[model samples]
Target: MLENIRDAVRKFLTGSTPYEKAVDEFIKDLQKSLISSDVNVKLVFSLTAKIKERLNKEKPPSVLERKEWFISIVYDELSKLFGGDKEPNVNPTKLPFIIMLVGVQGSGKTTTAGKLAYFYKKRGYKVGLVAADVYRPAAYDQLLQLGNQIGVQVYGEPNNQNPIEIAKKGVDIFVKNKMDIIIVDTAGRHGYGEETKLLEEMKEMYDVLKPDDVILVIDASIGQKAYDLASRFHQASPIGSVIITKMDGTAKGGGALSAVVATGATIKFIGTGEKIDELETFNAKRFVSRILGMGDIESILEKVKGLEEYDKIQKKMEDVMEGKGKLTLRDVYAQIIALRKMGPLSKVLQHIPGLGIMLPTPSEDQLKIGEEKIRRWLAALNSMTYKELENPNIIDKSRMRRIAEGSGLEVEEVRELLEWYNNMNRLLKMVK
Candidate 1:
């Protein structure tokens, strides 16, 4: 609970206190709130320093009052504690997808799997749960009843001790059953403190089951331990997703999130309460707004959104230009949006890798874009949310139709736009 920041926001907005003193006092409370909440220290100083620097350099937009400008600044800088732009693509890439959960014991691994099954099941997938943690008899029993409650298939070999074999067999059955997604809760690390043992097991299981994804389950109260733990687990397996549990139970939830972000891992789902349905997808901007007190800062954040978002998108594309990140559909949209203001299609194509810089020679087919295609592509891009734009991987046939309906275009037209976008990246990769 970052309640301290919320209270401080209200006080700062309403205070009769002098401007300099009020700003100083506000920083103290925030610094206090973040530290006790277990946010890593180096970032605390970096963040505080950045906020103060903004105070010195920035001026309120004519309509935004000075105090509101400060709140916007705090919101902007605080978002850095988490990374940017992309949200998790919760939808699976393939049918019969296998997801393995790995982490230390007591991170709610069993319950997390149950919640995950409930989530995908509701999303219309034939979700199946597998309790592969044979060391704990309680885990299997717990998974069994939860599966019964949800009315989904449950697999466990209570008499079997080989977790790896159990999981392989479990996944095999789920795949044969034609389930859309299968959740495997793996055995926990006995808190060996040094988790090379966990790493070995994770690698072995990953070798056997070849799960499509791995999730690192962690407790919200875990402070600095997550940094090291996540790094090893991330390297040991394909752990692109993280789930932080017991968010409502821990006042120090920020540390767990912060530590994971430090390890270059993004949090996917967060368990907000003990209820099976309490899991929520993580969104950084919303999380920051909540901490700054949503109602109080909404007006300022509203006025600032368009300018700030476009600025971030421009910077992100520049990063892409310099080889720091890959090109996203969002970047393509950004480039197209710029076309109306300044350049032609060829200039826009310059943003694509190998378009001009590498090839110099313009290929006629890629160069000649019909005005009709541009119009349709822009409409399709407009229909996408920030999540879909950031990650086009989740845009399958179904999603293509959704985008088509939303944009008032035919499915074939939308698919054509995506094919072009994808082939652009293919050329980019070939250029690399």
Candidate 2:
């Protein structure tokens, strides 16, 4: 499902089609991908509706291109589906933290426990793994093997069939031994109808051990069906969080959002692979940026920032036209610097509102000014006094020669700049 989104991002970024039409096409593709991934039809529609509402109510920032602005909006709204800006607090709030792992069988619950142990262990905590999984044979051995691999101690009773006793004893031992983080890996019984019994057992063990955090490990391939499973678990443990596994191996990984929405719980980490270090703390903004092509989005945003500086100059020019302020050579200098920071001249003009229609478009050659011109212009502006900059009318021919000598420019060039500034002011007043 997320793969389709990646493809859609490529199309949107490179398509020759008009922006509005491409956006509509991309939204349709998005809806189809999400629904096929098992997201609720109602939720899909609601998501698109919210996107549309934002598009209608919010204007693009003055510096961004129409298409770029639309994609940023998509990025913002899509992030909300997964968790928005709510990042999980992964660090323990108190010492000797106990975490309980629960999920259906085949949900990678055991392995996630090992990964969690490894994660905390690498973070400099004295982590211990507890294997309370007696329902599935070899579950203890699997956890033991993982514990040894990560250099963490394993607590288990091979002969004890009581999961509650195993969980309670394991946690007690770790707490007494002064372990910083104790992870209890409980059994998820055989599939389907046994969910109730498994959860009941989990609640029983939880009452005894009273873990600081209970995490539900979900298989990404289960898609949006995770909502029901996660919601039920959420009701059983209101303070719990979730971890979606097999994210790197699943096409339906997009359903991670559905589970989060249903459970009203934050996603603490994602299992990208089977490696002990494959787990990553979930960050919605960074995640969405990658999905939408990070390089492309990042470039657009950089240009937008540059454009903002350019717009400030435009606003000041307008203020001058309205008799609210005077446009100085300093403003011109700032505009040129902002333009240079924004890259090519053509791109800068494209982002400036009204400028494209107000002025004749520049020729390709005109757009290719040398850096030398920018340098000289900056030097010329720097040499002018505050009075000369604010009131160009006060600068006589003798003053121009003096300014030109100070800036290492010919007197003609300095006069040309003054002439250009006068023409620009006149044009702005006429436009107003």
Candidate 3:
């Protein structure tokens, strides 16, 4: 399960093996973990094949380490398997919307219902919970208690055993009361093999309530079997979405997630803990980032982004040197922003080709002035008009004063930035 995957990630990052050897070992470990967690054999192979294809064809960004780049690629492909870069639109499309929960019994469907209500209630929606689970004797009591805890309304018929009728009545009552979102906790089947009958019963309740959305609750511990179950449910109800519960308890979460995605159904949320507020809107990229060490991946991605931006600025600088374009405050502003993304000004200067090599090393005082000047210049640039940004020559004394006042800086600072720009332009011309 995912624990094995996490361990593999740690080993890949920390192991002293040769780069090529480490990659091979990690890939094998990943395959073994996925297979052991019950991910489909063919799907597991296909995933590795894609990863290898990417490795063969792609090159790492100039600023990123090769191993870090490889992990990023893995993160990209794995995210696609779990829904790619797409974020679920959790907001309701219409008022008085009804959501029906269906799943096998003991899938945490009841608790998930309560969590969903709490999620919406905090979002400023008038939420109502409906206990239509006649099969689970204590489901109504649990939901009622949850509603009280969350300060939302709960509708239930304790004496009634007919789920379909209860669902219909609950929805009608909530709609009449102008509730923004009505979540109905429906009866889950007693066993996994009875999904056919479960879905059949769902049809009856679905017909009666005609919910705006149908969500299938699944246990993360179910492993790769989630594929068949989710696929069948998707086939039966195309609009159905899924929520995986008890994710914090399961090592097979990766298998469950990959399997559900294989069925082409959207995973809206995941339960990370037993707490009511443990549910979170699942983002595949963020989830994978966490699995592979968030701090490491996030830092790498930021550097890569900063490097791309810096590359663009370098191209513009080259153009200015070649007499192809004029230097503008806009370019300087972008350069400063890019440098900030990468790190301190001195470090960024060292990474720029030829620039640092040609320039004299600055004293600590000079470096501090350069950094402070960059920040002030950025602020001043932000206060400039589009015309002024495009043609800094148009920034007269009066304009400088205006920009300075707007940026909360002295007018001398604006003039200083203009002077620096002139000196930079001349230096680039000399380099050309």
TM-score of each: 0.68, 0.71, 0.77
Which regions of candidate 2 fall more than 4 Å away from where they truly are?
Answer: 188-194, 295-432
**Clashing residue pairs, backbone N/CA/C < 3 A, model 1:** none
For model 1, how does the per-residue alpha-carbon lDDT over 242-286 read when each residue is reduced to its tens digit? 878788867777777887777777677786868878887777776
Which consecutive 10 residues in model 1 have the weakest lDDT in total? Answer: 351-360
lDDT of 2 by residue, 1-432 (tens): 556676787677674677777887789887788767756566767778898988878876655467767877788777877677767888888988878887677557688887778888778998877776776777668667878877888878876677877777777787788888887767555544566776777777788777888877777778677677667777888777878877776767666557566557668788686888788887776677777655454554565455455555553354324445555456556555545454455555544432222354343633334335545667776687666677767778887787788888778877776765676556544543
lDDT (Cα, tens digit) per residue for candidate 3, span 237-296: 877888788887676676777788887877888868588888888888667776776545
lDDT of 3: 0.71
Better of 1 and 2 by TM-score: 2
lDDT of 1 at 417: 64
For candidate 2, the per-residue lDDT at 10 reads 66
Local lDDT at 114 for model 3: 72
